[PDB]
Design a binder for these strands. Structure first.
Ligand SMILES: [Mg+2]
Length: 658
DNA sequence: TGAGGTAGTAGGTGT
DNA sequence: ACCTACTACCTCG
């Protein structure tokens, strides 16, 4: 039923009339970098349309300045247009007010002494120390304006790892080379390629032209935007960029959620008394607990790994093949036993084959693969020592082009490493097309499909989709080959159309209703063609955007933090807390936006949350994302890693990419 | 390549 | 303002 939660935000005082009335100042430039203008001007000023809004009186601005861009040196002329009223109810204007709030926060953060400040992040406490380093604790902050015209503070605890000696001093105590390194004078970062026994003056002079320190040896360095282009530097003016890997052999960085909540409140009070905008009042929200998904193997299960003993939801006659690259022979006995018990419990036929070929055999290897595929082999288990990334990708692509999905399982391998080999097996079986689990129950949409553009800003460079359809039949869709830039709407519609075609092949008809799930980056209009095409077909739909970041945090007011929390926010938007584990820090709720359709938010949250328990290749922990998006994510990744273009030998129920 | 999420480092649309 | 990559950590609905 109902529960109440805290968000990690805090209400502060309403804006006063002076703040609701920013100083307007239009700008003239010959012939975008309006932000640069706002910065050069100084004070609390942001872009407003093609002009500037500021909460600072003109007495402190630098109107006449010299903006120095990176392409064209432009002319800085700003002119006072009086004061302009903004309505917090109006999105654009409220966005202006919020940008002003943000600038305010940044300015007052900058005027603090004794703390490490990085943008809108402050780090006050010391949490752990070197040996040449320290870890500070603090929070990432944000400050904006509500619809009701009041300040809103966001706070989220975070640690920062800082080196306090030079690269020279760091390497002088024995430590290895960090993969990255930052200037001592500014925030710029480089990729440390190597060291150089070259002399300084035979380069040094360049830095000589610009302190209270001494320089060391030569460092080969690189700009991220050109990784193959080496450029010389001085170890004295360099500071290592330290990661967890650099401090591996020396710091507990995950917070129990009660502790995160505590630090959130305290840091909020602290910045609160630095801000002078009132007493931060934590905002509360009504949350709803969603019903628990009923996962089904042959019988009820609590996790997909249980299907290995209870039996699969839907099994068929299966042939699997073993490829060994460690020098030994035959199926390890406990693997055979587990597979046989699983298929036994499912009442299905199992055949275990052994591939007698080695990738070193070139065309003979491909031929033996083709022959295994002819004899009915659906997937291959590769027992191998840890492969180099390049070799992994080569071997996988090679098996795939002959129509054989592959599951890698690393040796040495012991029967007691049950989680590892059981997950390998679940992956193998999904790759063979088996349906290991499904949801039992009624859902409004009988087809749910997730779209992924590789995190990119558009589908114009392609993408992929995966779907769950009607029990839990899982399938993947790639776009057919053009390797060029396409019209994004047509890529999206083509992925969906192919998914509909598979559904129709299986059911003798189109679905009555589909649930379309997408990421948070591409513009919503990239889906317009697909939506209209569903409408022309009389198919109903909902489009829901699912954002992995930006959901903030959610805490219970009282009692324990539990999964399956649905938290409605502003009008078509809600938070969904899908997964949580106490040993796993604090959850990051998904932020979802209902973009099209008329299904109530509650029923959408219910289905999406339930799709989260469907992933067949994780035996013991549920994914945060609903399975179609999680799947699509992994699919685009593997398409990128293997170079796949015209897959034709692989059934769409074979989840080769998990 | 077991997998999950979270946690850290950095990134994207001169030397 | 949303996205990505890498590593570490701990644990196994
Ligand atoms: Mg896998």
């Amino acid at each position: 039923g109902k529960t109440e939660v805290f968000l990690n935000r805090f209400a502060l005082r309403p804006l006063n009339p002076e703040e609701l009335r920013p100083w307007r100042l239009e700008v003239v430039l010959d012939p975008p970098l309006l932000a640069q203008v706002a910065r050069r001007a100084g004070g609390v000023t942001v872009r407003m349309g093609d002009g500037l809004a500021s909460w600072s009186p003109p007495e402190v601005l630098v109107l006449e300045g010299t903006l120095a861009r990176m392409g064209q040196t432009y002319a800085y002329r700003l002119y006072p247009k009086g004061r302009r009223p903004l309505d917090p109810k109006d999105p654009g204007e409220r966005s202006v007010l919020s940008a002003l709030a943000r600038r305010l926060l940044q300015e007052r953060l900058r005027r603090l002494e004794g703390v490490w400040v990085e943008g809108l992040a402050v780090y006050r406490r010391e949490h752990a120390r070197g040996p040449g380093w320290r870890v500070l604790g603090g929070a990432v902050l944000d400050l904006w304006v509500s619809d009701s015209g009041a300040f809103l503070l966001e706070v989220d605890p975070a640690y920062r790892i800082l080196c306090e000696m030079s690269l020279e001093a760091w390497l002088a105590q024995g430590h290895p080379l960090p993969k990255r390194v930052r200037n001592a004078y500014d925030r710029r970062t480089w990729e440390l390629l190597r060291l150089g026994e070259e002399d300084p003056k035979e380069l040094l002079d360049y830095h000589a032209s610009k302190q209270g320190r001494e320089g060391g040896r030569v460092a080969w360095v690189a700009d991220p935007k050109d990784p193959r282009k080496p450029i010389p530097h001085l170890t004295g003016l360099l500071v290592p960029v330290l990661t967890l890997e650099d401090l591996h052999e020396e710091l507990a960085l995950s917070l129990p959620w009660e502790e995160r909540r505590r630090r959130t409140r305290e840091i909020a009070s602290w910045i609160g008394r630095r801000l002078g905008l009132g007493t931060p009042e934590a905002v509360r929200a009504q949350a709803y607990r969603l019903s628990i998904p009923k996962l089904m193997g042959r019988r009820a299960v609590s996790k997909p790994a249980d299907a290995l003993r209870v039996g699969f939801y839907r099994a068929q006659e299966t042939a699997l093949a073993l490829l060994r690259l460690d020098g030994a022979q035959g199926w390890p006995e406990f693997l055979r036993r587990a597979l046989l018990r699983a298929f036994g419990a499912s009442g299905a036929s199992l055949r275990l084959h052994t591939l007698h070929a080695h990738p070193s055999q070139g065309l003979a290897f491909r031929e033996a693969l083709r022959k295994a595929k002819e004899e009915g082999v659906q997937a291959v288990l590769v027992l191998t020592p840890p492969m180099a990334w390049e070799d992994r990708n080569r071997l996988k692509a090679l098996l795939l082009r002959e129509g054989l999905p592959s599951q890698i399982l690393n040796v040495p391998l012991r029967e007691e490493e049950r989680h590892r080999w059981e997950n390998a097996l679940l992956g193998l079986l999904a790759k063979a097309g088996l349906q290991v689990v499904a949801l039992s129950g009624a859902y409004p949409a009988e087809l749910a499909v997730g779209f992924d553009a590789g995190g990119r800003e558009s589908f114009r460079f392609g993408g992929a989709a995966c779907a769950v359809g009607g029990g839990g039949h899982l399938l993947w869709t790639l776009p057919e080959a053009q390797a060029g830039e396409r019209i994004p709407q047509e890529v999206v519609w083509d992925l969906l159309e192919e998914t509909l075609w598979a559904f129709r092949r299986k059911a003798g008809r189109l679905p009555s209703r589909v649930l379309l799930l997408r990421d948070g980056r591409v513009p919503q209009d990239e889906f317009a063609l697909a939506l209209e095409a569903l409408a022309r077909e009389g198919i109903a739909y909902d489009l829901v955007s699912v954002r992995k970041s930006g959901g903030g945090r959610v805490y219970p007011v009282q009692g324990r933090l539990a999964d399956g929390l649905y938290v409605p926010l502003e009008d078509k938007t809600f938070l969904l807390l899908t997964v949580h584990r106490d040993f796993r820090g604090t959850p990051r709720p998904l932020k979802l936006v209902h973009e099209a359709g008329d299904t109530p938010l509650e029923a959408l949250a219910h289905q999406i949350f339930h799709l989260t328990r469907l992933y067949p290749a994780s035996g013991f922990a549920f994914p945060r994302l609903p399975a179609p998006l999680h799947l699509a994510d992994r699919l685009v990744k593997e398409v990128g890693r293997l170079g796949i273009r015209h897959l034709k030998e692989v059934d769409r129920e074979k989840l080769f990419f998990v």
